[PDB]
């Protein structure tokens, strides 16, 4: 038997469920058809309304503590619950409900992780992380607008071929895949260690791919995958394409200033 | 209760229907009918079932920084936003952007259409057509035959190729755990298409999972990764070196952005443009012309694609507005003007000081206000059924000079055809392929496939769900064909010696007037695109998105006017009302984004 995952969507863009799909190695068919039954996900299911909330039941009954809650987006707690509807309830009842017999939680991206776009200030929703809601499970947060492709399912397969949670960092991600930051292994460190830098955009110093920390580049506080692993079977990742970082993996990063402002304390980084 | 508005005679006294969620859509949806004694459709109820409020979090924010908030509107349509927040801003502040990122910035547009189109019709769409069980039954070698007869040219077409993919199929449903075809609507009398039909487009669905993770990559080279690839305000952040490997963009980048090109020419040529031809052809026989709705009155697009850029008159997609099924007259659409787009919250959860008005978006409002009409069935918190006499959607009600229109691929056909029957030369192809694809559906397909000829005319066929489906497909294929010669434009640009990819002549906040306003709009993969913002001391003083799927599916107005997904549903018989089949047909063929609907 294959592990059910019901693939959950909060307050969400859908990034996660697309970059969820452009994974080369392993392929999202083989994940689907081979690894893991995906017997719930909105994105992707035949059945709907009456029909699709039935299957809910029917594997938490079949599979209790034995399957997994992966969760795409997240719950607000304003306009009582009812900026985000499913089946004429409150998300946060069926999220409650679907993860208190999930062997293990599964918070797909920043908007899971951390709040996402929707809880930057004001946060007219209070849009709120999966893990200041559900308290009493265990949580991996793999976070990222979306999360590389390969991440996802890198996450998946160890959680299948071992049927263990990852070890985790202090913030509960995958020390595997979230133990660099950005500017660790960074291409452009060499500029960055000799004060090279792109200065205005497509100035000859960005031609040159100069180091873009004073372009707002917040690859210094930033940890993710991207410099090595990279996006879309290792094709580039926003630095190498000629933009900086801007910190999307990271906790409230959409209110940590303009992201063109540069980081201050240049020396901590070198 | 019941009454008539344009041409529809609604009626709530039928048995009501649910649907919660509606799924194979992005971001959430309930939608309610009420059926007569007949199983036909009298009353239809759309309802965006979230809010997230990107237009009240940009409040005092940097414009420059606007284009990454927006983006996440939308994960699917990715990118489209960004590109209309930084046209956007480029408007207010009188930036003209270098012809190497107006190049770049369409061919990031046209990959996204060509990939969320198809994507959308595979993996979203077609198990609205296409029954995967009777897949099951299907002889290999028929099923060759067919395809051989659908797509000559697509190589993946012999026996053992389907009788392979169809083993796995086996394997897959006898292991118990049917995954996303678990509680389906298979064996339904409203699936028509062959075993053999429905085993050839399970295949291509497995092809175009596999194959749409790489035409994506061109958003990687260039905007460094998807989804959700960046932009820049005043050009494109892809510096170009040809002499040059620690340059974003270099000759060997570009080689790899043309074969990525011309893989989605000959997909979208022999694998997804045939199968909707095919399948729309079996469907016509079958007598399923509903879902037109809208359609076949009111369209509207802001035009696209100049083929010389900041000239409007050389969209290679002409735009505007048509009303009342007349085809002989386009109406201009000025996205500046505050009599023409403006949005109602009547029967939506905001408020606005009057209600009974309209506000063009550069005087928007976006207030939360989720309150439940008196005839609800059920509780705030838990909704039975939902009362579309009062408030009911997350949705805003655009409407154009007042009148609902529907906005997308099909509309953008429409108008195109209805421009080059007027003398427009840059709407040629559209014509050529709508002409092509109407003799395809009558006659070709019929006399390949032993069915009688048909005389539909275009002004028939395409006001349907079934071409509003054909439509997206051809427009897909258009998009691939468009972004090959910006390809080709790009290279001769930077090989006669310009490489410049930004204007960062008023980057520098301190260079800006002390106020300005603007608009960008984009036709986005679903249509109609449009960000409008107020500038004021550099910050962000109101920003403003209508969004596509914010036209079709709106709630009613406040003359009680009922917008496209609504009118889309009216009249049309279900098999069975407890399965939704014939709803979800045609609510996804306007590929709804409801993320996108409420932002
Ligand atoms: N296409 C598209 Fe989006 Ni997810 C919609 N509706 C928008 O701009
Ligand atoms: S600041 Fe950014 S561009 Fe520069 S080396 Fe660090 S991560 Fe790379
Ligand atoms: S913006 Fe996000 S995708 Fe990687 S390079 Fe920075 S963590
Ligand atoms: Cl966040
Ligand atoms: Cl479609
Ligand atoms: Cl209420
Ligand atoms: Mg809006």
Redesign the pocket.
């Known amino acids: 038997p294959r592990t059910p995952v019901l693939w959950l969507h909060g307050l969400e863009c859908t990034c996660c469920s697309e970059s969820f799909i452009r994974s080369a190695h392993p392929l999202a068919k083989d994940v689907v058809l081979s690894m893991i039954s995906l017997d719930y996900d909105d994105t992707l299911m035949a059945a709907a309304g009456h029909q699709a909330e039935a299957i809910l039941e029917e594997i938490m009954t079949k599979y209790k503590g034995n399957y997994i809650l992966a969760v795409e987006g997240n719950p607000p707690l304003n306009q009582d619950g009812m900026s985000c509807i499913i089946g004429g309830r409150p998300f946060i009842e069926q999220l409650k409900y679907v993860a208190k017999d999930a062997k293990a939680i599964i918070s797909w991206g920043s908007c899971a992780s951390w709040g996402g776009v929707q809880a930057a200030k004001p946060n007219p929703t209070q849009a709120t992380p999966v893990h200041k809601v559900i308290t009493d499970k265990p949580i991996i947060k793999v976070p990222?607008?979306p999360p590389?492709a390969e991440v996802m399912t890198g996450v998946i397969t160890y959680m299948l071929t071992f049927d263990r949670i990852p070890e985790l960092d202090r913030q509960g991600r995958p020390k595997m895949f979230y133990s660099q930051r950005?500017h660790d292994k960074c291409y452009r460190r060499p500029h960055f260690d000799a004060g090279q830098f792109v200065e205005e955009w497509d100035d000859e110093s960005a031609r040159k791919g100069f180091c873009l920390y004073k372009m707002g580049c917040?690859?210094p506080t930033?940890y993710?995958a991207?410099?090595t692993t990279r996006?879309n079977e290792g094709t580039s990742?926003?630095?190498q394409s000629g933009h900086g970082?801007?910190?999307?993996?990271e906790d409230g990063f959409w209110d940590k200033g303009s992201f063109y402002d540069r980081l201050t304390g240049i020396s901590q980084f070198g | 209760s019941a009454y008539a508005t344009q041409g529809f005679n609604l009626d709530d006294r039928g048995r009501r229907i649910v649907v919660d969620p509606v799924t194979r859509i992005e971001g959430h949806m309930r939608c309610e009918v009420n059926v007569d004694a007949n199983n036909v459709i009298r009353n239809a109820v759309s309802t965006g079932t979230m809010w997230r409020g990107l237009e009240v979090i940009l409040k005092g924010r940097d414009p420059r920084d606007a284009w990454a908030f927006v983006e996440r509107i939308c994960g699917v349509c990715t990118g489209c936003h960004a590109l209309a927040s930084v046209r956007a801003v480029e408007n207010a502040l009188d930036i003209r952007i270098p012809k190497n990122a107006h190049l770049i910035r369409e061919i990031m547009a046209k990959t996204l259409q060509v990939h969320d189109h198809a994507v959308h019709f595979y993996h979203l769409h077609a198990l609205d057509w296409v029954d995967v069980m009777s897949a099951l039954k299907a002889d290999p070698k028929r099923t060759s035959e067919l395809q051989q007869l659908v797509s000559p040219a697509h190589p993946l077409s012999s026996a053992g190729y389907f009788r392979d993919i169809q083993n796995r199929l086996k394997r897959f449903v006898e292991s118990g755990q049917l995954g996303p075809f678990m509680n389906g609507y298979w064996g339904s009398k409203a699936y028509v298409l062959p075993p053999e039909a429905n085993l050839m487009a399970v295949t291509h669905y497995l092809e175009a999972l596999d194959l749409q993770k790489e035409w994506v990559k061109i958003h990687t080279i260039f905007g460094?990764?998807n989804p959700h690839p960046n932009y820049l305000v005043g050009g494109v952040p892809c510096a170009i070196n040809l002499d040059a490997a620690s340059a974003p963009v270099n000759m060997e980048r570009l080689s790899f952005v043309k074969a990525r090109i011309d893989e989605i020419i000959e997909f979208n040529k022999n694998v997804y443009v045939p199968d909707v031809l095919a399948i729309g052809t079996l469907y016509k026989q079958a007598g399923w012309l509903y879902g037109g709705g809208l359609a076949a009155t009111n369209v509207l697009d802001y035009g696209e694609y100049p083929n010389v850029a900041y000239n409007k008159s050389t969209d290679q997609l002409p735009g505007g507005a048509i009303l009342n099924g007349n085809w002989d007259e386009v109406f201009p659409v000025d996205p500046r003007d505050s009599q023409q787009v403006q949005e109602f919250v009547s029967h939506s959860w905001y408020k606005y000081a009057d209600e009974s008005v309209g506000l063009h978006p550069w005087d928007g409002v976006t207030e939360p206000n989720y309150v439940l009409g008196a005839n609800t069935k059920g509780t705030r918190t838990r909704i039975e059924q939902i009362d579309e006499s009062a408030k009911y959607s997350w949705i805003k009600s655009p409407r154009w000079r007042g009148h609902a229109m529907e906005v997308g691929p099909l509309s953008r056909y429409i108008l195109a055809y209805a421009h080059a029957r007027s003398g427009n030369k840059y709407a040629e192809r559209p014509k050529e392929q709508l002409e092509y694809s109407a003799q395809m559906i009558n006659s070709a397909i019929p006399k390949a496939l032993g069915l009688p000829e048909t005389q539909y005319t275009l002004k028939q066929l395409l006001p349907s769900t079934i071409g509003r489906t054909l439509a997206r497909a051809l427009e897909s294929q258009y998009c691939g064909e468009m972004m090959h010669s910006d390809w080709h434009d790009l290279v001769a640009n930077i090989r006669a010696g310009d490489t410049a990819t930004a204007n960062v002549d008023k980057w520098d906040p301190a260079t800006w007037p002390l106020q300005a306003k603007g608009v960008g709009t984009v036709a986005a993969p679903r249509g109609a695109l449009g960000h409008w913002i107020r500038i004021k001391d550099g910050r962000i003083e109101n920003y403003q998105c209508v969004v596509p799927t914010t036209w079709n599916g709106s709630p009613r107005d406040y003359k009680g006017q009922i917008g496209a997904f609504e009118a889309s549903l009216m009249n049309t018989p279900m098999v069975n009302p407890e399965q939704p089949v014939e709803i979800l047909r045609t609510l996804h063929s306007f590929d709804p984004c409801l993320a996108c609907s409420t932002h």
């Open positions: 990222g607008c590389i950005i917040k690859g930033t993710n991207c410099s996006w990742f926003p630095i970082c801007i910190g999307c993996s | 460094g990764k």
